[PDB]
Every structure is written in structure tokens, then in C-alpha cells.
Amino acid sequence: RETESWKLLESSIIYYEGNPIGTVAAQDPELAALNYDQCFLRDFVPSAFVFLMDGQTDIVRNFLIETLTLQSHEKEMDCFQPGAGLMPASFKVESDGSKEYLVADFGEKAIARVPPVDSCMWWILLLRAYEKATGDLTLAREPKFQAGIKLILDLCLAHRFSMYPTMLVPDGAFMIDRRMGVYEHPLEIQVLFYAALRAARELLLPDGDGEQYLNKVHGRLGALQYHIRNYYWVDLKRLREIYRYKGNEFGKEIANKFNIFSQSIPDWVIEWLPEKGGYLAGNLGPGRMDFRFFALGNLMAILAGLASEEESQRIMNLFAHRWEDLIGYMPVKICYPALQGLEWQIVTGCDPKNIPWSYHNGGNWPVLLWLFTAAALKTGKVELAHEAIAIAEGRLSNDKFPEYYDGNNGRLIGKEARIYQTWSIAGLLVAKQFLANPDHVEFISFP
Amino acid sequence: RETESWKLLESSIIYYEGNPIGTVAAQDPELAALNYDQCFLRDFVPSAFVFLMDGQTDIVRNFLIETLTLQSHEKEMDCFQPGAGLMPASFKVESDGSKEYLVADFGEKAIARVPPVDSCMWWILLLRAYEKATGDLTLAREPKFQAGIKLILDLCLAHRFSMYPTMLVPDGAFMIDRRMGVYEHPLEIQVLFYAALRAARELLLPDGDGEQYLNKVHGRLGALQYHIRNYYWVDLKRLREIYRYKGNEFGKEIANKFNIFSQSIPDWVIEWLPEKGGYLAGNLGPGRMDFRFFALGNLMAILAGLASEEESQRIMNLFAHRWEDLIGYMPVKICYPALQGLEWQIVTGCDPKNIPWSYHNGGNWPVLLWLFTAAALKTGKVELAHEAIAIAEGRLSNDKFPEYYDGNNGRLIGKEARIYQTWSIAGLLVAKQFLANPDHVEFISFP
């Protein structure tokens, strides 16, 4: 392209041994580098989509290859190894002098040592997206790629103590990589887990032990989908039911299985839901239901076919009804509402980067526009995509594409936002491209 | 024995096909049965110790056998199975009419569907204790028992995403079986996990795939111990260090790895610790340190040899210094301090059974006296055991052996306490028996 955004993305590209292998997190000139000079696996996904749609796919291929290689490297902290299948949160290229080499952060350098659980899932989704964009079936089939997928599946499908098909994680294990009360069974992890499973179903070779893998995958998918749809789904009708639940019920055949106390349901959600609206809850576990709306989880649930067609309609209906809360002056609010006061103190451990309506704690994130556009297109609500894109276009180039926006409605540029945040740039590009050729959404959606 | 307590325990015994296989949770006449007419695996352990020391060991043997059989039964909820190794929280004997049969609760009937993670660990510890009390090596070696242990190990040793040797659980996965902010990496789970591993090391046959199991076990133990001792351990010196930590540090070689913000350290702990005192923290995870003192975790850490000899001394030094907080009018407070106010609301989801200084939320639990006596004996602090026992003896028979006591110092009989709680009865019995023959502590301790 000849646009400003195309050129900005082009300079983000990281080269290794004369080859493009990824993109930097940001091209901010004045902020301390911290880990933003690295290539984050989750960040790379919207950049990858841009390159796949342009038709220059070697950077995507090289990324997938190098990341797979990174997985093979021994990862350790104090004589203990995680599962071999773990993908790192990010990597950078280090020049010792002379020859180049790749250094990864698997969680052993990460702040608070958060595990990048979503990384390995995005890896699979990007592998699928590569395949569907290019038609190249050879990459995924190759021995090392097959083995790589299986290692990821081993970690995902690992046996639980719990009675539930969902996946258990520590706090800060996905896009929200800091302590945000998204421990246990956060929506985003479950939705990505579900999507990656469907992808693996397309990607795996039957020959070898794959048959057993595929049967595991098919089994988990059904259970996962049933559980998510029946227990996470929130609308007025279901809320009315939960609110009338009786506490401390014991036995197999009971209504309140997770022992939710109605007195704990927050006041804001009853007023917030429209009659024809609804969404997937943020979390579910013993005695706990997180009613916070999480944007990525809900939008990807539409794209992955996890939410039903009607349920997808009701999520979009919610976006329309509460446009100022979830889009406001910058698509898209990452979650709603913000944690405030003592709740912010207890749940985040007084994390100053996640003060109310900032960053993960109810900030607005430009990148999420690409998921929103795709979901809007999938649900036949093109007009919402136009409006969201229009709003983002009106401020991003002028604000130099900040990492995130703050405030109840995203009025403020993020407190500590990097400028020239690559996936803020890629996010808008992808959204416009989807809008131009809706079919491309099939790279990331499932029938 | 000819004592009142001996007879009370005797009537708790559950018979199945003319054989003793366990004990009821309570013999309370007026409370709704709920799940207290069942045999809880964790509850049975102190009863089992009484019977092992008396020398009537068939009930213990039958319990171990039947529980192992229960493990084999298909456990499911909505087309999803947990790992085969899962032990149930409790079982009861049901008379359809004519023939008897055993029905278990694996979490699918449990309130809030909490998983009984500690159950499978106690199963192994009781198996070891049986063996050491009786000298019978045949039970554990038998094919079905070996397989049973390995299934449990498969679940415990299952591969993580995290960089840590600790074990990840949902909230309410141990003795505290309700939502209490003990999700992620609660001390008790880690200590029991560590103890069960050492037991498995004694129990496993080398022949077969056992060699690989034993090497896994030996590997995990070292990592687990190092991690617990270095990161969970709290005293003035370490607290001074943590408080001076700088937030948001990135990289491998940093002091504040889990990104604890000093401003979040609670005010109470600085005043609470004596100079020569210390303890293992309640939890550790991304951006999170739980400074609450958990009694079972800390005492079992002494018995399991997890805490160092000095560290064990410093824990007991803490008990002595804060005797009124942790023992008060009834040994032993389950954890300190209580969650109060909005913290109680947010963390427990307004759980009315766990109001401040009640039940799990800072209540006093008679059963924990047996662990305290054993730890006191192991640390050469017999006098503390005498005093704790004296206090419990002064009220338990008169109060009809309540399940728990409430209040800052356990003045009140628990709000919803069952009377004739079996492990309240067994707990005192075990403590007196340990006191009479200190060597018996070797049934539950490790060198």
C-alpha cells in the first residue's frame, strides 16, 4: 500500500539473517525499552494478517518456523521445567557482534513471571490462518510442526482435578498479562483454547498417534462448548434465574452448581443489560462468577463459532446498546466495568499500571478493532464496523497510534501508552482490509 | 480405651458388608445431614491414626481398599472426565434395600463443585502411615495399589504452563473447601503435594515404568522444596527485603520476580511477627503474595521436613509469641487474620458460612491439634503441646466436641458447627496418644 500505516508497519519488521521474522511491539522513540523492543507472539498476529492479505507471506512463514524452534529450547527456572510445548511471550534478536541469535522470554524474564498461555494458542491459530491464506499445506504437516502442535495439545489437554472441560490458569495468563482477577477460568483462555482445538483438528495428520489426539480434541471441544454456552452465558433471563438461586445446594441434580450467592451479583449488570442483549461471562469457578464483560473473549467466541448464531447477535446487540461504554472515543474497551477503590487494591495488589479505566483495567485498546470488525461482518452488522473504524481513524494517526487509551470512554491517551504501537497500527489496517474483502475473515473464523 | 472419646469414635464407624470401612463426619442429632453423614477422606485420617495406634488396623486397610475402588469408578459431569486418579471428597453407604453399595462425591455433588485435591494426597499419606504402623508392605505393592498411586502422580506431576514446581488449583481445593482466596498456589496444597511425593518415593515398586516415576518424583521434590523455602518463607529479614523491592522489574536476574508491590504488604504482618519468628506464606503467584498464616500448611511443613530445622523452630516460636491469636481458647486457628468487610465480600463472594472469625475465615479447628502436637514434639516443644491439649480438654467434652469454634480467640462455639464432629474427637485422641508415645509421629513425619 501507499498509506502511512503500511509504511509504519514495514519499519516495525525485525530481520534475522537477512530474513523478515516478525515485528516490534512499538517504535516509540522516548519510552524505556523494557520489553517493547521484542516481538510478542500475540502482537504479531494482526501484523501477520496484514501481510497475508497483501500476499507477502514469507515473514509469517519465518515467524512460525522460528517460534517453533524457540519452543524446542530448554526453558527453566530453579531446576524446574514447564511442559516442552510452551511458547514464549516474546523474543528479540540479539547481536553479540558478528552473528545474530534469538533470545526468548518464556515467563522466566516476564514481569511477575506470568505464563504466556495464550501464546501457544495464537501460534496454532496463526498457523491455520497462514495455511488458509496461502493454500500451503506443507508447513503444518512437516514433522517438526506436527510435533510442535502435539506438545501444545499435551499441555492444553493435560488432566485436571476439576470436573470441568475448561482450562485452569494463574492470573495474567493472556492478553491481560498482569494481576487482574482473571485467574482460574478466564473467558479469553477458554475461547482461544476452543479455537485452537478446532484448528488442530484441521492441522493434524492422522498417521501415527494423531488419531488419538484427534479423538481427544473432538471430545474436549464438545464438552468445552457445552460448558461455556450453558454456564458462562449471561442475559436477563439467565440473570433472573441465577438471582433466584438458593445457596449451599448439595448433590448432582441442583440448579446452583457453583454455589453463587445472589447477594453477590453486582448491581451494575442488571441495569446494564438491554432486553435483547447478552454476553459470555468473564470467569467461572467455585463460588465465583465474574460478570465483567471481556471484549476479546466475547468477539473471538463469535469468530470461533463457540457462541451460537443468536448469541452472537445478542453480543453485537449489547455493543450497539452500550456503544459509549464499549467503544466510546476509541474501540475497543478491553473489559467493563473497571475495578475501583478497595476492589482495585485487593484484586490487583495495588497495581499502579492498572488503575481504574487504565490499560487492562477498563482501558480502550485500538488493536481489538480488528476482532470487532470481523465479528461485525460475521454477524451482518457492517454499519457498526464502519462507525468503529471511523472513530479510530479520527484519532490514531494524529495521536501517533498509541498502545491504549484511558478513561470511562477512552478520552485520554493511555497513562503509560507507547506510541507507534504496532498492533494498534495493524489492528486498523486489518479492520479496513476485512471491510474491503469480507472473505478474508475466514482466515480467523470457523464455520 | 475406656474413655468417653474412644466410645464416641467407635460409634462413628461405618460398616459395609459386615466390615468397618470408615467413620462419619459427625454424629450430630439435630443438624440437617447435608454431607456430614458421609465419610470424608481428609476427616478419616485422624481417626485412622487412632486405630493404627490402638492396633486395630482392618478399618484402615478396608478404607484404603474401598477408596481405591472408588477411584476406578467413572466420574463425570457433562461429557467430561477428570483424570482417572481423582479421589472423592467423601463417600457414604447406601442401602437400596437388601444389598449395600458405595456412592462417592468426586466434586460432581460437592457444593460449588470444589475439587478434592487434598483427598488423593491424604490417601497416599494414609497408605504410608498404614504401612509404617503395621509393617504390612503387601497392600501398597499390590498391582491395583501401585496403579492407583501412579494415577495420582500423573495428575500431580501433569505438565504446567507456569515456570514453577508448585501445583495449580482452583479456589477451595483443600481443607478449606469454599471460596476463600486460596486459589492458585495455596500453601496446604504445596505442602501435602510435597509430603505425598516423599511417600510415593517409599511406596513405589521399581519394576515396570516405576523407575521413570521415581525420577520424576525425586526431581519435583527438589524443585518444590527450593521454591517453597526461598519464596514462601516469611520473617522480618525477608519482609524488610520485599518491602524495599522495586516494582515492574523485567529480566531473569531480578530481585522482585513475582512483581510484588511493597505498598500492598499489609500493615498487620509487620507488627505481628516477633524478631525470632517466621512462617511459610499462604500463597504465591503473579503479582501476588498471601501473607495470611495458614496453620495446617505450616505445621505439616514441619512434619514433612519441608521447612528446615531452624525454620520449624521459628514457626513454633511464632505460635508461642502469638499464642492468643493462633491457639486462644481452642487450638488451632485455621488461618490468621480473618478476611473482613469489603475484602470478605470480594474474596468470598459474600459467603455467609465464612463471615469474619468463623469457620474457614479465621475460625478455630479442634482437629488441627493433632498436627500441632506432632510438630511441637518434633521441634522439642512438648510444653506447648501440653498447654494446647489442656485448653482443648477443658472445653470439648463439655461442648460435645464441636466441629469448629468462632471469634478472634475461639470464644464462641462455631456459628453452624456440627456437634460430635469425629475429627474433633479423633484430633484430641491422636494428640494425647502422640504425647504418650512420641515415636508414633513417625507415621506422619518424614526424616
Added chain:
Amino acid sequence: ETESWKLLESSIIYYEGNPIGTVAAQDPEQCFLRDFVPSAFVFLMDGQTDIVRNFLIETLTLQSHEKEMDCFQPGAGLMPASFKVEEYLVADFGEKAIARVPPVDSCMWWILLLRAYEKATGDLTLAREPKFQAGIKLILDLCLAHRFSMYPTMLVPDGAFMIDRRMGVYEHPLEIQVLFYAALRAARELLLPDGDGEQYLNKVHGRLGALQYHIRNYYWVDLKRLREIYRYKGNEFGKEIANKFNIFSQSIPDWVIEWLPEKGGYLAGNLGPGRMDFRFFALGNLMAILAGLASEEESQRIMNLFAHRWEDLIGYMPVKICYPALQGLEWQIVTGCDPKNIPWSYHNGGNWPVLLWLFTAAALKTGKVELAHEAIAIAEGRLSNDKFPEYYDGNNGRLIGKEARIYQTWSIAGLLVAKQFLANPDHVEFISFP
């Protein structure tokens, strides 16, 4: 001449081959005028007087520097909070200082130090020099600037002294009024009775009596006085009224009522329209004793307060800078959510080793030798092991300061001065008045 002596020697700054001051800290990782004071005292008692002389000379030169912020020229008398050697001298006058705080206490410490130098060396010549006499007059011009109000105290913005961050110590904080009083008394001796010098002396006499009266009568807090204020009627209008500053008793905090011992007493932290700050500030109260601003009875009462509330005010590390700490919402509102001054940390109720020298001096003057002994003992038990932290935190000072610099010079000099004061009490006359 222990390790502490070596660290202080190593702290010394040189400029063109001459010792001119000491660094704030030798933390493995400049000169603050207030920080230099306890160092100076050690040098004077050890006979190394030239470093103190040079400091007074060099800082005097800094005063005359033309400075401005945004096209505005302030009063000439201003002294910087700190300076650094770069060779040439460069000064921070609050121009580059965080929050643009004005170092009001700097110039008063300058005056008190000039006096101490003279008392220590018996050299009367330095202060008599025209440049020194001019320096003093410039400081007085600013201090004695005419006011709109009937208060003879000195008006300042927040964070204008040792506590140099926003801490609710704006308006008429004790420390400033006490240092103001002491500096005026020092100037009373130091000024030349020249034609010009006479007019300055007139203004000094004209403000000194009024200031002492105001502080003693309206800042003094004890049970008896507290009982009066608690019974004040609100919204009194007139010249002859009891509740002049219109204190509303329902706002008197519950802690002070139970805090005061029967024989205890202290100077309040602040006074102004509708405002009494009941917080205890250690430096203001201890210097009031030394400067002779508090009466003998009042000095004894303050020491009684220390003895009675030893855990609050001394605890693990002498001495708590102020009590009690702003907490919760109050901390939010009054400090503007200042992360360096969280409850029981730093300015907001931390414990500061340097204050030990003031406490020792005050205890010696009041005859409470035992309290000096115990205070010093507590400090000696920790400081070396902890590497002389800048400050300590917590209700009782158990924790080493959150962001404390190690090898903080006035923590080191503070202990030395205290020990040497204890060894020879006559030396307290450097910072005290007959």
C-alpha cells in the same frame, strides 16, 4: 574514630583543593545545606573548622546568583536546597527541585550554622564581614516581609522545610516558625549595629517577641489547653474572643485525647484560619527546646511526652519525623496520592536517624540523660548493620525505609553528634541559646 568517622571523611566534597561540604549519600547506586549541618557539628567538635567556614562562604556566594523561572525575578535572599560541584558550583533553588518547593529552612540553617561556627571557634570576624552581614540582611528581608494577616508567623507553601513534599505542612508549619525564631535570635547577636544594621535589629526585635508569644500561646497543646479548645464556641466574632482561629471541636481527632499523658505536652504542627494540625512534629518541638522558644516547663513536658510515648516516637529507630501518619483517604487528599509518602513511610510518619542529634541535645538540655542514652543505644544497635539507611518505616520504625538511600550522611553524622554531645554536653551550646 570508628567506621562512621571514615564514611563521613569519604563523604567530604572538594572544590579547587578545599573541603566545602558533604554528599547526601554514598549509596553505591551533591551537598544539601540542611544535611550538612550535623556533619558540620562533628567537624567543629573535631577542630576541622575550615570545611565549615568554606561551606558558609561558598553557599553565601550561591545566594547572590541571579535566578528566574519564566521571566520572573524572585527575592535575592533565597538560598538553594542543595548544590553540586561541576570546575564550578551549580545550585538548585527549587528551580529544578521536584514540585518547585522553596528551601525556606536552608537559609535559616545557614544563619544557625554561622552562629554555631562562631561559638565553636570563637572567631567573631567571619559574621562581621560585609558579605556575611549582607547575606544575613537579605535572608531577613524575605523572612520579615510584610504580611496581609495578623499572624506574626511566617507564611509558606507546602513542602517548604525538611519535609519538602506536599504533606499538609503548608501555611504556618511549626518547624518553620521555630527555625524562624531561632534564626532571628541568632541574627540578634550576629548583626553589626551599623546605621543600616540598626534598622534590621529594630525589625528583629519587632517580630521576635510577637512570634514567641504567638507560638507559645496558640500552638501549645496539653490536656488543660485541649479541654479549653474542646469547649470553644464556634463562629465567634470580635477582638476579645477565646476561639480566635475558629477551631471546631468536633474536628479535634480522637487520638490526641488518649495520646497525651497527664504531664505531657507539645507544640502543635500548624495553625491558621479554621485550622489546628495536632500532629506531633519531632524537629519543630525539639528545636523549640534548644532555641529556648519553649519555656523550661514546656521543654520538660515535651520530654515527658517522649518518655510516655516512647514506642510511638522512638520505637525501633529514633526519631519519628511526625505522628501519626496520614492514612487512607486523608493520605490521598493531603499528599495527592504521593507514593513516596505512603502511611508510616518517609515524611508521612517514618523514623529518621538524623533527628537523634536533635533529640540528644534536647534531652541533655532538659536533664533527661537516660533518654539520650536509651535513644543512642537503640540507634547504635541497627544503623551500622543496616548500613545507615536514610530513613526507617512502619508504626515503630521496624522496616528499613522503602526507598531509603544507604550510607546517608546525616544518619551517620547524626549518631556521631549525638554520641559526642553525650560525651561532652557543653557542645550543645553550638545549637542552643543561653
